[PDB]
Every structure is written in structure tokens, then in C-alpha cells.
Amino acid sequence: AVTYPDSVQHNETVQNLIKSLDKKNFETVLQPFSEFHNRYYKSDNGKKSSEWLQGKIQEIISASGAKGVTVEPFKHSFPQSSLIAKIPGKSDKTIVLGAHQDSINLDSPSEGRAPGADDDGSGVVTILEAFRVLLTDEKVAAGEAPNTVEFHFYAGEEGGLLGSQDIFEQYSQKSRDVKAMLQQDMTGYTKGTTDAGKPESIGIITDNVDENLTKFLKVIVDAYCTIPTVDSKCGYGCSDHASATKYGYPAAFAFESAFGDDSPYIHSADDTIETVNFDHVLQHGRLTLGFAYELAFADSL
Ligand SMILES: *[C@@H]1O[C@H](CO)[C@@H](O[C@@H]2O[C@H](CO)[C@@H](O)[C@H](O)[C@H]2NC(C)=O)[C@H](O)[C@H]1NC(C)=O
Ligand SMILES: CC(C)C[C@H](N)C(=O)O
Ligand SMILES: [Cl-]
Ligand SMILES: [Zn+2]
Ligand SMILES: [Zn+2]
Secondary structure, three states: OOOOOOOOHHHHHHHHHHOOOOHHHHHHHHHOOOOOOOOOOOHHHHHHHHHHHOOOOHHHHHHHEEEEEEEEOOOOOOOOOEEEEEOOOOOEEEEEEEEOOOOOOOOOOOOOOOOOOHHHHHHHHHHHHHHHHHHOOOHHOOOOOEEEEEEEEEEHHHOOOOHHHHHHHHHOOOOEEEEEEEEEEOOOOOOHHHHHHOOOOEEEEOOOOHHHHHHHHHHHHHHHHHEEEEEEEOOOOOOOOHHHOOOOOOEEEEEEOHHHOOOOOOOOOOHHHOOOOHHHHHHHHHHHHHHHHHHHOOOOO
């Protein structure tokens, strides 16, 4: 049972950090990430893409001056490893930011083309960029934030939340104190929203999540995003936040749109950068940044 701030406590600091977000870094990383034929978790393709992604995280770390920050693989029974990047803070209360790094072509999983641009390359470059900007803060890079922050890049999500299943089950066993988890899975597709004349917005998934955290998540989107929220259900174990919920951890899920307006190109060769709106991905970078900062600096957690 975990409770959160009623309202944002570091508006000025987060707003200044938001100005450091470089919209060009999304496509820079997303373009080569989507060039792997697929990132199938059972496949050597997914192994190679995981290693490539780990290198890109490491470059952000090496370039940051943050002496204590690490990135490590998390082996699974399949070739594609998950990746956990740790920003250690004063306490062991941990804030997790999630995306999944695999992709699938449901008609030909082993060999089919799956650029996975929106599902879920968009969430990977979203939280990778918020991670980079987070380390430009002196106290965060110094390990003086009240709480620990981790960024997770889950292997094997398209096989049934396989990587996050492994990770959170093991966190549960080793008594890891995960006070808040935010999953981001598809953050780029807005053409379904705008084609219907709906205002572009941040989807907020309301099932398989924690109510208090989802409430705080909306608080974060109102302070730090310049678009509204819309509440949606998806009606099943949508994404990796369901693995966190399964082990009693408070989780939330921010989405590109209302669930019925999301990308129809996922799980096929047609999930391409063409379908991705990076100005919307930038909005998810702002809420990721703000969520991570406000909770890293929440003493009452
Ligand atoms: C957070 O701080 C910002 C300033 O960085 C406040 O900015 C308001 O909106 C724009 C910037 O987006 C400014 O030009 C306005 O002057 C501000 N409006 C008002 C009425 O002051 C923003 O209001 C702050 N947010 C909260 C929740 O306090
Ligand atoms: C985020 C949701 C649209 C579901 C997710 N794309 C999946 O792996 O099934
Ligand atoms: Cl609890
Ligand atoms: Zn998917
Ligand atoms: Zn997905």
C-alpha cells in the first residue's frame, strides 16, 4: 500500500529539465533500432538488438558524469536479455520506468519483418531520453536523490510479459522496495486520434494498475504535459505493468491515445517510423521526466 504527493512539488526544477529534452534524439535511436529485421525475443535478432540498446544506454551513462549509475543485462531462458539501468539514491525506495524492447510479426514470428517502431520502440526512446535528461541534474547524478530510480527495458514482452515476469518475481523474492512503476508501451501514434477529430491526448489505462499511482500519474500529466488525459481500459494483461501488479507493486500505464484509437499496424511489418508522431513522443518524454523526478524527490514515500 503506497501513497503519493497530492500535487507536484518541484515544478520549477522539472520545467527547466523539460527544456533539456531533445526531440531529435527519439528518431536518432529509433531509426537504427527499427532496422533490425525483427527484435523477436527467441531470436538472435533480439539478442543483437538488446546488446545494441545496452551500448546506447552505456554511452548516455559514460557521457553523464554520474559515477554510480549502471546498466546490466538480466538473462532469461531465451537469447534476448532485459536491461536494467540504476540511478542509486539515498534510500532503497525504488521508482521503475518501463518499456519493452522486443517486437514481433504475429504472422511470422521467427522470421517476419517487425520494425516495432511504435510497439514498443517509441516507449524505449521515450524513457531512454528521459533517463539522459535526468542525469543532467546534479543531485540525481550525485546519488543524492532521496530514492533510487531504475529504467527497465523488458525482453520477451511479446511472448507474454516474459522478461518483466522474471524481473519482478525476483524483485519480490529479494524484497526489493518498488514504490512506483510506470510502463510506457506505444507512445507515438496519434493519427487514430486526430483523424476522428479528437484532441490528441495521453491515454491513461485504468485496469491492472494501482489507483493511487494512476491518480498521481494524471497529476503529472496536468503539470508537465501540454495535452489532456483520457481514461481507457484494455481488458487484459496489456503490458509489463501487469507483471509488477502481479507481485503487489504499484504500477501505472500511460498510452498514446484512447485504447481504441491506438496503432493498427502493431505486430506486423507496417509498424514503421512513418506512423510515429515524435511531437507526441516528446509529450511522453515530459511526463516520464516529471514522474521520475517528483517521485525520486518524494521523502514521504
Ligand atoms: C509551473 O511553472 C511554470 C513556469 O515555468 C508556470 O508557467 C505558466 O505557464 C506558462 C509556461 O508554460 C507561463 O508563461 C505562464 O506565465 C505561467 N502561468 C501563470 C498563471 O503563472 C506554471 O503555471 C507552473 N505550474 C504550476 C502547476 O504551478
Ligand atoms: C500496449 C497494448 C496495445 C498491448 C501491447 N502492444 C502488447 O504487447 O500486446
Ligand atoms: Cl504494499
Ligand atoms: Zn506488442
Ligand atoms: Zn507492446
